[PDB]
């Protein structure tokens, strides 16, 4: 319990939350204009994942 919290940046979303497939997802709520389209749409999630992969590269 004394450990530190899991602090991350925006790169953590496309690295674990978006890569998750439908069976590992049900619903989501956000407010960012870039991530709002990737709520219940898998195509937008994959597009954002690819964009993040190309950016970090």
Active-site residues, by number, are 16
User: Which among 20, 53, 54, 17 has a CA at the least distance from the CA of 32?
Assistant: 17
What's the CA dihedral at 21, 26, 31, 37 to 10 degrees? 50
């Amino acid at each position: 319990a004394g450990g530190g919290n899991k602090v991350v940046d925006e790169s953590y979303i496309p690295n674990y939350l978006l890569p998750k497939t439908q069976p590992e997802l049900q619903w989501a709520w956000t407010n960012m204009e870039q991530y709002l389209s990737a709520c219940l749409n898998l195509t937008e999630r994959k597009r954002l994942v690819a964009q993040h992969l190309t950016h970090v590269s």
